[PDB]
Design a protein around this motif. Structure first.
Motif, mmCIF file in Angstrom:
data_model
loop_
_atom_site.group_PDB
_atom_site.id
_atom_site.type_symbol
_atom_site.label_atom_id
_atom_site.label_comp_id
_atom_site.label_asym_id
_atom_site.label_seq_id
_atom_site.Cartn_x
_atom_site.Cartn_y
_atom_site.Cartn_z
ATOM 1 N N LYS B 91 -13.079 7.497 35.900
ATOM 2 C CA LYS B 91 -13.228 8.984 36.366
ATOM 3 C C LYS B 91 -12.669 9.065 38.145
ATOM 4 N N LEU B 92 -13.090 7.913 38.817
ATOM 5 C CA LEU B 92 -12.635 8.028 40.225
ATOM 6 C C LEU B 92 -11.093 8.057 40.591
ATOM 7 N N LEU B 93 -10.782 6.595 40.043
ATOM 8 C CA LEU B 93 -9.159 6.234 40.153
ATOM 9 C C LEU B 93 -8.491 7.445 39.754
ATOM 10 N N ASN B 94 -8.716 7.998 38.617
ATOM 11 C CA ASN B 94 -8.040 8.876 37.839
ATOM 12 C C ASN B 94 -8.552 10.366 38.027
ATOM 13 N N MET B 95 -9.426 10.604 39.301
ATOM 14 C CA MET B 95 -9.753 11.936 39.389
ATOM 15 C C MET B 95 -8.883 12.920 39.613
ATOM 16 N N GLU B 96 -7.541 12.711 40.076
ATOM 17 C CA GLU B 96 -6.754 13.646 40.372
ATOM 18 C C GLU B 96 -6.125 14.291 38.943
ATOM 19 N N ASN B 97 -5.785 13.243 38.131
ATOM 20 C CA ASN B 97 -5.544 13.822 36.833
ATOM 21 C C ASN B 97 -6.330 14.542 36.090
ATOM 22 N N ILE B 98 -7.862 14.316 36.553
ATOM 23 C CA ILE B 98 -8.867 15.003 35.759
ATOM 24 C C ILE B 98 -9.283 16.286 36.352
ATOM 25 N N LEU B 99 -9.225 16.321 37.897
ATOM 26 C CA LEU B 99 -9.374 17.615 38.481
ATOM 27 C C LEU B 99 -8.202 18.632 38.250
ATOM 28 N N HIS B 100 -7.086 18.049 37.932
ATOM 29 C CA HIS B 100 -5.633 18.519 37.772
ATOM 30 C C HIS B 100 -5.705 19.436 36.583
ATOM 31 N N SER B 101 -6.466 18.917 35.509
ATOM 32 C CA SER B 101 -6.355 19.662 34.227
ATOM 33 C C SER B 101 -7.227 20.727 34.084
ATOM 34 N N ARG B 102 -7.778 20.995 35.435
ATOM 35 C CA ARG B 102 -8.704 22.244 35.465
ATOM 36 C C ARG B 102 -8.242 23.110 36.583
ATOM 37 N N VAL B 103 -7.818 22.385 37.696
ATOM 38 C CA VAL B 103 -7.335 23.356 38.635
ATOM 39 C C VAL B 103 -5.819 23.192 38.762
ATOM 40 N N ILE B 104 -5.147 24.424 38.933
ATOM 41 C CA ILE B 104 -3.817 24.482 38.909
ATOM 42 C C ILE B 104 -3.213 24.969 40.129
ATOM 43 N N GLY B 105 -1.996 24.335 40.296
ATOM 44 C CA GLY B 105 -1.455 24.405 41.610
ATOM 45 C C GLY B 105 -2.480 23.556 42.535
ATOM 46 N N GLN B 106 -2.843 23.810 43.818
ATOM 47 C CA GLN B 106 -3.481 23.102 44.619
ATOM 48 C C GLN B 106 -3.483 21.631 44.444
ATOM 49 N N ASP B 107 -2.456 20.749 44.542
ATOM 50 C CA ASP B 107 -2.468 19.382 44.673
ATOM 51 C C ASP B 107 -2.749 19.059 46.047
ATOM 52 N N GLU B 108 -2.174 19.895 47.114
ATOM 53 C CA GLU B 108 -2.608 19.548 48.392
ATOM 54 C C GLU B 108 -4.110 19.275 48.441
ATOM 55 N N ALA B 109 -4.853 20.367 48.010
ATOM 56 C CA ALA B 109 -6.606 20.037 47.935
ATOM 57 C C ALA B 109 -7.052 18.937 47.034
ATOM 58 N N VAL B 110 -6.665 19.024 45.725
ATOM 59 C CA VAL B 110 -7.182 18.063 44.967
ATOM 60 C C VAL B 110 -7.034 16.549 45.379
ATOM 61 N N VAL B 111 -6.083 15.840 45.980
ATOM 62 C CA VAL B 111 -5.645 14.546 46.410
ATOM 63 C C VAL B 111 -6.563 14.346 47.688
ATOM 64 N N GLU B 146 -13.729 27.060 41.642
ATOM 65 C CA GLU B 146 -13.129 26.486 40.551
ATOM 66 C C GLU B 146 -12.937 24.886 40.784
ATOM 67 N N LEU B 147 -12.519 24.488 42.019
ATOM 68 C CA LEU B 147 -12.505 23.037 42.376
ATOM 69 C C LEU B 147 -13.975 22.546 42.325
ATOM 70 N N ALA B 148 -14.693 23.499 42.796
ATOM 71 C CA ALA B 148 -15.967 22.968 43.021
ATOM 72 C C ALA B 148 -17.049 22.702 41.641
ATOM 73 N N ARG B 149 -16.641 23.572 40.447
ATOM 74 C CA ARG B 149 -17.002 23.170 39.272
ATOM 75 C C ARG B 149 -16.437 22.444 38.803
ATOM 76 N N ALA B 150 -15.172 21.777 38.885
ATOM 77 C CA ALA B 150 -14.517 20.642 38.181
ATOM 78 C C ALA B 150 -15.167 19.476 38.780
ATOM 79 N N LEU B 151 -15.446 19.453 40.287
ATOM 80 C CA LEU B 151 -16.031 18.250 40.711
ATOM 81 C C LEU B 151 -17.513 18.120 40.080
ATOM 82 N N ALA B 152 -18.252 19.042 40.326
ATOM 83 C CA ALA B 152 -19.661 19.022 39.482
ATOM 84 C C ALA B 152 -19.432 18.518 38.098
ATOM 85 N N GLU B 153 -18.519 18.914 37.385
ATOM 86 C CA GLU B 153 -18.291 18.397 35.861
ATOM 87 C C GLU B 153 -17.885 16.896 35.865
#
Lengths: 178, 177, 94, 94
Positions: B91-111, B146-153
């Motif tokens: 979940k951690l190493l692949n967090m980005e893959n995971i947050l990305h599937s819920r949060v669109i655009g915003q790669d600057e933020a996710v990473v 939306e990112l805050a949710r995906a983080l919680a999840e």
């Protein structure tokens, strides 16, 4: 109905040995009794030797009240009485810290549920019921100034109590202690 | 919890309905014996008893179940799945893959968040401080919440394990949270 | 000394078991009441020693109920008369 | 008057100590039970005066346990038979 000594287990199956040796079809309290005096070495067995009750004297009263002998032996089961008598020895040992039942407890358990054939063998062999629980007892046992009063429980004595080698570890909080 | 929860889970097959069958047979047996009707029942005893030794050999076949429970962590930790590793650090190493599937655009933020959580969550940040302290800047309806949710999840397990205050409410010297 | 008794069995099979022996000079009758089965024994002429004896056996398979025997004769449910043991042995021991 | 006794020692070394003397016409057997060691003495033929005497000594080194001796023979832990004292003297006094 659980696990007892060899001596118990042997004495119990030994009731069955006697179940059939006379041909009856249910093993009642009378057979559990034959079982005890016939393994002749249990504390239970030992006691009976005291009251004046060898296998000789007993089985004569019993055959004098049942006798043969439908060889039926159609895979037999207990008397409901004796099933109670077994349920009881389990308790006549909770009541003794004895972690496991054995020859005595079963003899103890019979007296307790006195209604039944064993009981009558003896009230017939002139051996009231209490003279008997006694004999078993006198073959088992146990293991201070002001302590008199204190020494209710309230409130158990940490000290002498752990003087008896009886104490464990104990891990601290080693500087909590000091 | 587990110092039972295992002897508990231990004594939980479809071998219920024979009990029900069995029941009425005995019953059927009784009624006829007081009607007698013996044979017409002794039938019924020879018959209840076939079912007796029947069920036993799947209840004495349940010391087949003593064996399967033995002590090791196996039993201990499952205890915990209540009171609170490959696909947990994945979940951690692949967090980005995971947050990305819920949060669109915003790669600057996710990473940035992925890496920060992964920093703290890996031993580096001081444990007495939150897992992560962030400020989310940007326009509305972009993904802030939306990112805050995906983080919680992803991090806490539940897209809904999220407290949300509206600071409009705290503009005056009455600032008592 | 009394020579007639009323015993209660917990489950019926307890009665079958009792049957599988010797009744012997023993008239006996069997009722059904409160779901439990009571059984009523009547020794004609036996020495007290001989009866306290016999009765021993019975209670390997039953207990002795405080039940007024006429409560049964009225408000019970008859099942087998006079030869109550004997009949169960017929339809049940093998 | 009885001529067989069962004594409990607090610590084992108390037993070694007892050994370092004279058993004398005394069969003796030694059990281990409740972590404490019991020792079972059997005098064959001695005058009562002669036994009340001897037993005195023993209880400089033990006390006399109320314990049913057969409790041991069954539920104990045997360590040395018949010549219980004699044996400890061998492997322990020097």
């Amino acid at each position: 109905f659980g696990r007892f000594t060899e001596r118990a287990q042997k004495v119990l199956a030994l009731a069955q040995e006697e179940a059939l040796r006379l041909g009856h079809n249910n093993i009642g309290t009378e057979h559990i009794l034959l079982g005890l005096v016939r393994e002749g070495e249990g504390i239970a067995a030992k006691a009976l030797q005291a009251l004046g009750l060898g296998s000789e004297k007993i089985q004569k009263e019993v055959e004098s009240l049942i006798g043969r002998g439908q060889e039926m032996s159609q895979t037999i089961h207990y008397t409901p009485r004796a099933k109670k008598v077994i349920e009881l020895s389990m308790d006549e040992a909770r009541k003794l810290g004895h972690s496991y039942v054995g020859t005595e407890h079963i003899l103890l358990g019979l007296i307790r549920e006195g209604e039944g054939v064993a009981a009558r063998v003896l009230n017939n062999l002139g051996v009231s019921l209490n003279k008997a629980r006694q004999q078993v007892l006198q073959l088992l046992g146990s293991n201070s100034n002001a302590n008199t009063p204190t020494l209710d429980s309230l409130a158990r004595d940490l000290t002498a109590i752990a003087k008896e080698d009886s104490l464990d570890p104990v891990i601290g909080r080693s500087k909590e202690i000091q | 919890e587990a110092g039972s929860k295992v002897r508990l889970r231990s004594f939980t097959p479809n071998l219920k309905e024979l009990e029900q069958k069995l029941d009425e047979v005995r019953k059927e047996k009784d009624a006829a014996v007081q009607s007698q009707e013996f044979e017409k029942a002794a039938s019924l005893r020879d018959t209840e008893q076939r079912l007796r030794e029947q069920v036993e050999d799947t209840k004495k076949s349940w010391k087949e179940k003593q064996g399967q429970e033995e002590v090791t962590v196996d039993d201990i930790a499952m205890v915990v799945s209540s009171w609170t590793a490959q696909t947990e650090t994945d979940k951690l190493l692949n967090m980005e893959n995971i947050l990305h599937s819920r949060v669109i655009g915003q790669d600057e933020a996710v990473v940035a968040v992925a890496k920060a959580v992964r920093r703290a969550r890996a031993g580096l940040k001081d444990p007495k401080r939150p897992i992560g302290s962030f400020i989310f800047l940007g326009p509305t309806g972009v993904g802030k919440t939306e990112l805050a949710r995906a983080l919680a999840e992803s991090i806490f397990g539940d897209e809904e394990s999220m407290i949300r205050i509206d600071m409009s409410e705290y503009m005056e010297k009455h600032s008592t949270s | 000394q009394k020579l007639q008794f009323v015993l209660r069995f917990g489950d019926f099979e307890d009665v079958i078991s009792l049957s599988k022996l010797n009744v012997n000079g023993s008239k006996t009758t069997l009722y059904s009441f409160e779901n439990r089965y009571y059984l009523y024994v009547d020794f004609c002429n036996m020495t007290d020693e001989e009866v306290e004896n016999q009765l021993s056996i019975l209670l390997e398979y039953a207990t002795e109920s405080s039940i007024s025997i006429h409560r049964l004769e009225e408000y019970g449910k008859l099942i087998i008369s006079e030869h109550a043991l004997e009949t169960i042995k017929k339809h049940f021991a093998s």
